[PDB]
Write a structure and sequence with these properties.
Elements (H helix, E strand, L loop, with lengths): L1 E7 L10 E9 L7 E7 L2 E2 L6 E4 L8 E9 L5 E3 L3 E3 L4 E5 L4 E4 L5 E9 L12 E6 L2 E4 L3 E4 L8 E8 L7 E9 L1 E6 L4 E5 L4 E3 L2 E5 L9 E11 L7 E4 L3 E2 L4 E3 L5 E3 L8 E12 L4 E8 L3 E6 L1
Parallel strand pairs: 10-16, 18-28
Antiparallel strand pairs: 1-2, 2-5, 3-4, 3-6, 6-7, 6-8, 9-11, 11-14, 12-13, 12-15, 15-16, 17-20, 19-25, 21-22, 21-26, 23-24, 24-25, 26-27, 26-28
The structure holds magnesium ion (MG).
Magnesium ion (MG) binds next to loops.
Length: 303
């Protein structure tokens, strides 16, 4: 038996890679030792006439269906190989974290990069990928995964990871936009309020989202208002309501996050406060990124 096959040092290639194809003769011993090789790519003639065909700085042009015909010059028997299909692949690079997200204050943000080859094959088992992370004009690390330490409003921005193989010709990128989310308190709750028995109880805590720089593309932010009261000797605080609309003990919450009750009772005499929580909407899900708790108001129902 006298057979031939193409053996390759790569399963596929990325732009700028090198590779080598090898006509490999098999079968019963001794195998014919005086041989000519004729190579074709996609049915078209190739100039290379040696046992190995080598490519350097590959481009799309080097992809294609290779075949070698080997002739034994003693007998003149020629044997052609099955084609070896050499395909060009591209890197798909991904970040595990959301494309855009807000973070809570005083945290270290971990980012992870993942990579796949477009054709579901790596070029070779040991093939080496290079990672480079940057924010704007500065390289923040050369590792696949990185950590942004002590994230502050001035680290708001777009972080990008670039990945490539043997040549930067094969580079592909992913980006994520990360911003600090905090709240500002524009109007604190009143420190004390005395209310005529039978008249209206109305309390407000005015806070807003505090976001520095360009918020474009970032997750929708919402605020929810949690209202409490605690009376004398009373052990744990009563949560009056959370959602807008009506609430417990005759209290309602307006659309703006205001606490309201029609007519006071001597039982409404208590401390009130609000805990306002900031949420970012990511996919179908909502997650608190900040909170503000109001000063307690001493609510006196008299006369
Ligand atoms: Mg980790």
């Amino acid at each position: 038996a006298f057979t031939v096959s193409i053996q390759s040092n790569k399963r596929c290639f990325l732009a700028g890679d090198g590779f080598t194809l090898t006509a490999t003769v098999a079968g019963d011993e001794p195998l014919p030792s005086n041989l000519t090789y004729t190579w074709t790519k996609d049915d078209q003639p190739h100039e290379n006439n040696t046992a190995t065909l080598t490519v350097a700085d590959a481009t799309s042009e080097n992809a294609g269906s290779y075949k070698v015909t080997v002739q034994d010059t003693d007998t003149m028997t020629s044997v052609e190989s099955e084609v070896f299909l050499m395909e060009e692949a591209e890197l798909i690079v991904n970040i595990t974290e959301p494309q855009h997200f807000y973070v809570s204050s005083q945290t270290d943000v971990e980012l992870h990069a993942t990579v796949k080859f477009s054709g579901g094959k790596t070029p070779a088992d040991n093939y080496e990928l290079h990672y480079s992370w940057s924010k704007g004009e500065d390289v923040i690390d050369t590792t696949q995964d990185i950590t942004i330490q002590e994230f502050t409003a001035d680290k708001n921005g777009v972080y990008t990871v670039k990945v490539w193989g043997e040549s930067e010709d094969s580079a592909a990128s992913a980006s994520t936009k990360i911003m600090l989310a905090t709240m500002n308190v524009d109007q604190d709750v009143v420190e004390s309020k005395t209310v005529a028995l039978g008249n209206e109880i109305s309390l407000n805590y005015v806070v807003s989202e505090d976001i520095v720089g360009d918020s474009s593309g970032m997750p929708n932010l919402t605020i929810k208002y949690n209202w409490y009261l605690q009376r004398e000797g009373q052990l744990s605080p009563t949560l009056i309501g959370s959602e807008v609309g009506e609430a417990l003990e005759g209290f309602s919450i307006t659309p703006d996050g205001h606490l309201f009750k029609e007519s006071a009772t001597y039982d409404d005499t208590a401390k009130f406060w609000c805990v306002a929580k900031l949420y970012q909407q990511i996919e179908d899900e909502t997650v608190e990124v900040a909170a503000s708790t109001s000063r307690k108001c001493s609510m006196e129902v008299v006369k």
